[PDB]
């Protein structure tokens, strides 16, 4: 199974899949009810999370994470390691002896959910703060906006 | 001044204040476009079409007559080529300088001019790739260049 590529069976803990109802229910269709939440700060849940079948517990809409803290924005730089991406934030720092600025940047690793498909490394992503998900990951992608070369 | 030369020449064209077609030119916009299509099928670049029209038919400017530019007309009809003409002529000169350079290994000055020409090629290629005219993976190969020309 594509959904079952790991050594342990993957399921949404809130969902019970063994409701013995009737032979007709077996005959009719086997599609699990899915748990999705409304991560809400004006954000909308993508429809690929309500209709998807992926199993990932660090997703905000269909996983066990809470979004609180800071809302930030960045530009996608690298998509290489499994299920997480590296983004860049560019800012100006003020040096007051010369009354001038200098460009500085930060590289920040965020978690990317499967509900956000067809994303390339040029585009603006909004991120929300959550609990520590790994050693160097504390943010999670909440919205994807295409870059200047929008099709 | 010049990009790759120390010259500072001033010669150019001076458009008149009149943006209006004169009364003695009786060619309609559609008839002016017909000559553009006709000369586009004889392997004429837009800049060649412009001088032909100017010298022969009394067409000072086609933006002033038909309200459009020659390359836009050709692209709307589908007669624009793959590479832009300015980048096409720069690659043609690079092949000629490089072809002279295998029979002449001690020609140290053509080796300088080829570097200048390919720098100009890279500048135009960068500009066109930022404009989504060339595909992002386009790259000028010093050996494969003849395939483009």
């Amino acid at each position: 199974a594509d959904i079952q590529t790991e050594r342990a069976y993957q399921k949404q803990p809130t969902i019970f899949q063994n409701k013995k109802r009737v032979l007709l229910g077996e005959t009719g269709k086997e599609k699990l009810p899915r748990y999705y939440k409304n991560i809400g700060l004006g954000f909308k849940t993508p429809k690929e999370a309500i209709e998807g079948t992926y199993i990932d517990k660090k997703c905000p809409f269909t996983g066990n994470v809470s979004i609180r803290g800071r809302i930030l924005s960045g530009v996608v730089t690298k998509m290489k390691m499994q299920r997480t991406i590296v983004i860049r934030r560019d800012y100006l720092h003020y040096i007051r002896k010369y009354n001038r600025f200098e460009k500085r940047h930060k590289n920040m690793s965020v978690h990317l959910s499967p509900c956000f498909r067809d994303v390339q490394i040029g585009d603006i992503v909004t991120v929300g703060e959550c609990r520590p998900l790994s050693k160097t990951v504390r943010f999670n992608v909440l919205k994807v906006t295409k870059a200047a070369g929008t099709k | 001044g010049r990009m790759h030369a120390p010259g500072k020449g001033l010669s150019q064209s001076a458009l008149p204040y009149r943006r209006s077609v004169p009364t003695w030119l009786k060619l309609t916009s559609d008839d002016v476009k017909e000559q553009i299509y006709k000369l586009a099928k004889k392997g004429l670049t837009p800049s060649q079409i412009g001088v032909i029209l100017r010298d022969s038919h009394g067409v000072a400017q086609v933006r002033f007559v038909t309200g459009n530019k020659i390359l836009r007309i050709l692209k709307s009809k589908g007669l624009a080529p793959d590479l832009p003409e300015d980048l096409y002529h720069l690659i043609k000169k690079a092949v000629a300088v490089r072809k002279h350079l295998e029979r002449n290994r001690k020609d140290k000055d053509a080796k300088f001019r080829l570097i200048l020409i390919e720098s100009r090629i890279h500048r135009l290629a960068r500009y066109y790739k930022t404009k989504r005219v060339l595909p992002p993976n386009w790259k000028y190969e010093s050996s494969t260049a003849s395939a483009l020309v």
């Binding site: 003020y94 040096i95 010369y98 001038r100 600025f101 200098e102 460009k103 | -």
Partner: protein, 141 residues
Amino acid sequence: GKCRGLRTARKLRSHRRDQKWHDKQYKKAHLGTALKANPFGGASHAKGIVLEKVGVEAKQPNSAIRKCVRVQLIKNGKKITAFVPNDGCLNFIEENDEVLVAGFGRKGHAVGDIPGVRFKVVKVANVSLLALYKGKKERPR
């Protein structure tokens, strides 16, 4: 000329950092080689033991004999030459005496006719040379 942009602070600060090292006062203070070569080690005064009485002949056009003393420093074992300031004040110093020694006015530079001497005597055996010279105190017995 110099760059004058709004995003030039890094350039300006790095250039100033690099060019400050061409100031010899700044380099001397901030490099650390002039602190290791200083016999006093950054102190204004130091104590030492008298090894020998020396006489240093003055630089031209002056012709005289400046009366100094060779002193070994207690805290590090280094050896210096110290000038005995006033008239006849060398008669108060004896060998193997402990003396207090100070700088001689120019922050490690020689002063006047006296060649290569950077230090001067202040006290001998816990008695100031001024008190001995003016007859306020005498050498302990």
